[PDB]
């Protein structure tokens, strides 16, 4: 017989950082395996399609990076823009909305994220289809939609709703009675604004916060450095420099030394491409997780527990980062725990009564009904509770009284 | 021509490389055949291949008020 | 030949402590420990919420609390009988090892 | 060549395990720590706990 | 005009089993290929990384 109901909350913004794409490398394998050499190229043709299926495999990875980036960001049919006046009921998005002063019109927090993240041998790096300036129009559209229209721009066309009425809707989503917002609206606006302040302090001070995106950029750079270093190996040949073999040996002998290099460079390219195909599946599963979090957290409100960081989810704001995305997940966390005696049901005039919504609680002398997530006591009435059965059935029921709103109106 | 300047190679220099034969058009459209770096190409009007910066969608402000 | 096996960072004992914590939390505080602080709740009331969550009015639980507790207790006993006799029950983990 | 074959198979198999681990982690959060409204996510029937 | 409404219920418990991890193997590529052999190891070095 004891329930703890928290008499207060804190609003916590948690950064979640996700890889969304990787560097669109592509390698002219016929240049890497045989560089500017006719004699070597003719020998490499004896291996049939071992080259064009590697040109093909890397092209499949490169093409799907724009698929990943389009699926994550382009979840919006229109480029929504924020109003001139920022009349958002006290909430302050100015640190996550665009800065018109910049050449590429990223937000303040998008500039921190773009700061914290850091050949001749047939290797190339293809550009993304969406420039980091177009990604920043899409996150600004998702975000100007999220702020002015809530989830409704995911269901239909954006429907405007005041931000103090959009958060009141999200408080009903976590089961907190929406007057708990209005009676605390300045406190909630200030905790959101203060929690966005901590994001800048985190991201400005602590470069290791971006660890997933810098890890993805390091793995791709380490694989290319390994691939380029593997040109320097002999693989049993007299020399790793193809021109030194050709300038020294006649064809009947040069071809043998070259075949040794071809075998080694081809196996060493297949190793890179296999690693990139498995690494691209690891990023594709992260792009689909980022696309799913965009759809359920940003375009919506998630009932999934711990999907949008610790706490009951309220909303999320996407920010872009180099080859990734960042969600500033806003969550209600219940804070000041209090202790109460509690009852499964209450007995009045032989009947058993249960709360339509909330928990019967006792500070120690009186009984109240109140929502589970926020201590807000109410005098117990036929409007908060319903009758079913009688006192002789419920285990641990208590003999209180339940008030009738009609009696005094007919008594007087 | 990927990752080259329009030197060594109706010519449009993009960050994807030197694009030859496509007309550069100021009007944006939905992306059709992607080139890269924000540029897509398509066959349109008399018809020819054109290149343009792709549209991300129609612009639509929300009539937000308190 | 150069083939070795490294130990896991979390030993079986440590895993058991985590499942114990998750279980103790689930039983004594419902879902509140997931969101924030573990807020104690009488187990029967916790179940009442669990019932409302599936579209069944809470009075059903209380009126049938003895039945529900008995069905639960019996169901767990059945789990033990299955796991203790059906080797194939853990095929998903045995297959990884194999 | 034998090692390369082994390692490649381990990387692919590891990806399968990782996906399973991710699912298990998702369930822990959305099944043990909460209550699932997602059908057949946490067994057949209406999930309680 | 006909609806079936349950009059009784049963609480059932089901078991769902998921892999989380796999054995953390580690292979010494040099010892595997050229176990205790200097002559073999020097040849192995010609394969670079
Ligand atoms: C539990 O709450 C009730 C209601 O607030 C308290 O009873 C009231 O206490 C105030 C302040 O002493 C009095 O002015 C009211 O006349 C009391 N009656 C009501 C309104 O119920 C009760 O004292 C609280 N529990 C404790 C600490 O005993
Ligand atoms: C709902 O079903 C349960 C059984 O699953 C019923 O409980 C049983 O009742 C019979 C008598 O008819 C007893 O012999 C059994 O031992 C009881 N089993 C248990 C587990 O208690 C229950 O009465 C049914 N309820 C309704 C309203 O029909
Ligand atoms: C509730 O009672 C327990 C008794 O062990 C105590 O430790 C705990 O701090 C109390 N909680 C509050 C909010 O007072
Ligand atoms: C091409 O060369 C000119 C100089 O003649 C230079 O100004 C321009 O930026 C170069 N463009 C590219 C894409 O390298
Ligand atoms: C775009 O319009 C400007 C005038 O504002 C003109 O100078 C430029 O040549 C046009 N570009 C193309 C590709 O038509």
Q: Would you say the C-alpha torsion A64, A69, A70, A72 has a positive or negative sign? A: positive
A339 C-beta closer than 6 A to ligand 3: yes
Please count the other Cβ atoms lying within 10 Å of the Cβ belonging to residue A21: 26
Which of D35, A183, C72, A145 minimizes the C-alpha distance to B64? A145
Selecting from A230, A234, A236 the residue whose C-beta is nearest the C-beta of E49 gives A230
Residue A391 Cα, gap to closest chain C Cα (Å):
10
A76: helix, strand or coil: coil
Distance separating alpha carbons of residues A319 and A97, to the nearest angstrom: 9
Question: H/E/C letters for each residue in A33-56?
Answer: HCCCCHHHHHHHHHHHHHCHHHHH
Which residues in E lie closer than 8 A to residue D6 (C-beta atoms)?
A: 27
Question: H/E/C letters for each residue in B3-57?
Answer: CCCCCCCCEEEECCEEEECCEECCCCCCCCEEEECCEEEEEECCCEEEEEECCCC
Which residues in A lie closer than 8 A to residue B52 (C-beta atoms)?
A: none
Query: CA distances (Å), A102 to each of A150, A206, E44, in order?
Result: 27, 24, 54
Work out which ligand 3 atom sits closest to the CA atom of A4: 13
Distance separating alpha carbons of residues A21 and A25, to the nearest angstrom: 12
Chains B and E touch (3+ CB pairs under 8 A): no
Selecting from D28, D33, D37 the residue whose C-beta is nearest the C-beta of C31 gives D33
A364 C-beta closer than 6 A to ligand 1: yes
Chains A and E touch (3+ CB pairs under 8 A): yes
By the 8 A CB rule, do D32 and C22 touch? yes
Distance separating alpha carbons of residues A164 and A169, to the nearest angstrom: 9
Q: What is the resolution of this structure in A?
A: 3.1
Residue D37 Cα, gap to closest chain A Cα (Å):
8
B10 C-beta closer than 6 A to ligand 4: no
Residue E2 burial (C-beta neighbours within 10 Å; 0-12, 13-18, 19+): exposed
Q: Would you say the C-alpha torsion A31, A35, A39, A44 has a positive or negative sign? A: negative
Confirm or reject contact between A307 and chain D (CB < 8 A).
Answer: yes
The distance between the two most distant Cα atoms of chain E, rounded to a whole number of Å, is 88
Confirm or reject contact between A261 and chain C (CB < 8 A).
Answer: no
Residue A362 pairs with which residues in a beta bridge?
A341, A367
Q: CB under 8 Å to E23, separation ≥6 — which residues?
A: C5, C97
A223 to chain E: nearest residue by CA?
E49
Put simply, the answer to whether C62 touches A393 (Cβ < 8 Å) is: yes
By the 8 A CB rule, do A373 and A320 touch? no
Q: Are strands A25-27 and B33-36 parallel, antiparallel or unpaired?
A: unpaired
By the 8 A CB rule, do A162 and A101 touch? no
Selecting from D17, D33, D37 the residue whose C-beta is nearest the C-beta of C34 gives D33
A393: helix, strand or coil: coil
C3: helix, strand or coil: strand
Selecting from B2, B16, B64 the residue whose C-beta is nearest the C-beta of A148 gives B64
Residue C25 Cα, gap to closest chain E Cα (Å):
19
Give, to the nearest 10 degrees, the angle between helix A108-116 and helix A132-149: 140
Structure tokens at A178: 């929406």
Which of C52, B43, B2, E15 minimizes the C-alpha distance to A386? C52
- Going from the Cα of B5 to the center of ligand 4, the distance in angstroms, rounded, reads 6
Helix (H) or strand (E) holding D14: helix D2-27
Query: CA distances (Å), B24 to each of A132, A363, B6, B50, in order?
Result: 22, 75, 15, 6
By the 8 A CB rule, do A225 and A238 touch? no
Structure tokens at A235: 């693989």
Residue A248 Cα, gap to closest chain E Cα (Å):
20
Confirm or reject contact between D46 and chain C (CB < 8 A).
Answer: yes
**Which residue in this structure is represented by tokens 């009015």?**
C57
Confirm or reject contact between E47 and chain A (CB < 8 A).
Answer: yes
User: Both ends of chain E: CA-CA distance in Å?
Assistant: 75
């Amino acid at each position: 017989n004891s329930i703890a109901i928290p008499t207060n909350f804190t609003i916590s913004v948690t950064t979640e950082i996700l890889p969304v794409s990787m560097t669109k490398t592509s390698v002219d394998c016929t240049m890497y395996i045989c560089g500017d050499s006719t004699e070597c190229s003719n020998l490499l043709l004896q291996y049939g399609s071992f080259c064009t299926q590697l040109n093909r495999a890397l092209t499949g990875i490169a093409v799907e990076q724009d698929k990943n980036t389009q699926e994550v960001f382009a979840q919006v049919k229109q480029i929504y823009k924020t109003p001139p006046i920022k009349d958002f009921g006290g909430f302050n998005f100015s640190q996550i909305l665009p800065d018109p002063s910049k050449p590429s019109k990223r937000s303040f927090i998008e500039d921190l994220l773009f700061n914290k993240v850091t050949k001749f041998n047939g290797l190339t790096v293809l550009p993304p289809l969406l420039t980091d300036e177009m990604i920043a129009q899409y996150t600004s559209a998702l975000l100007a939609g999220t702020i002015t229209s809530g989830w409704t721009f995911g269901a239909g066309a954006a429907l405007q709703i005041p931000f103090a009425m959009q958060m009141a809707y999200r408080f009903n989503g976590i089961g907190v009675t929406q007057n708990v917002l209005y009676e605390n609206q300045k406190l909630i606006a200030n905790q959101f604004n203060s929690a966005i302040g901590k994001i800048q302090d985190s991201l400005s001070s602590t470069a290791s916060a971006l660890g997933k995106l810098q890890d993805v950029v390091n793995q791709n750079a380490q694989a290319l450095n390994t691939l380029v270093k593997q040109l320097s190996s002999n693989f049993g040949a007299i020399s790793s420099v193809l021109n030194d073999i050709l300038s020294r040996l006649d064809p009947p002998e040069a071809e043998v030394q070259i075949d040794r290099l071809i075998t080694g460079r081809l196996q060493s390219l297949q190793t890179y491409v296999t690693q990139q195909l498995i690494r691209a599946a690891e990023i594709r599963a992260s792009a689909n997780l980022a696309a799913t979090k965009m759809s359920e957290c940003v375009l919506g409100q998630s009932k999934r527990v711990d999907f949008c960081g610790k706490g009951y989810h309220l909303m999320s704001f996407p920010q872009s980062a180099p080859h990734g995305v960042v969600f500033l997940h806003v969550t209600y966390v219940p804070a000041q725990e209090k202790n109460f005696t509690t009852a499964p049901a209450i007995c009045h005039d032989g009947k058993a009564h249960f709360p339509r919504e909330g928990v019967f609680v006792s500070n120690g002398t009186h009984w109240f009904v109140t929502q589970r997530n926020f201590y807000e006591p109410q005098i117990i009435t036929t409007d908060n509770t319903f009758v079913s059965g009688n006192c002789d059935v419920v285990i641990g029921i208590v003999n209180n009284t339940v008030y009738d709103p009609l009696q005094p109106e007919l008594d007087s | 021509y990927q990752d080259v300047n329009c030197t060594e190679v109706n010519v449009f220099q993009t960050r994807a490389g030197c694009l030859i034969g496509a007309e550069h058009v100021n009007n944006s459209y939905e992306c059709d055949i992607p080139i890269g770096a924000g540029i897509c190409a398509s066959y349109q009007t008399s018809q020819s291949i054109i290149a343009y910066t792709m549209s991300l969608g129609a612009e639509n402000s929300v009539a937000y008020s308190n």
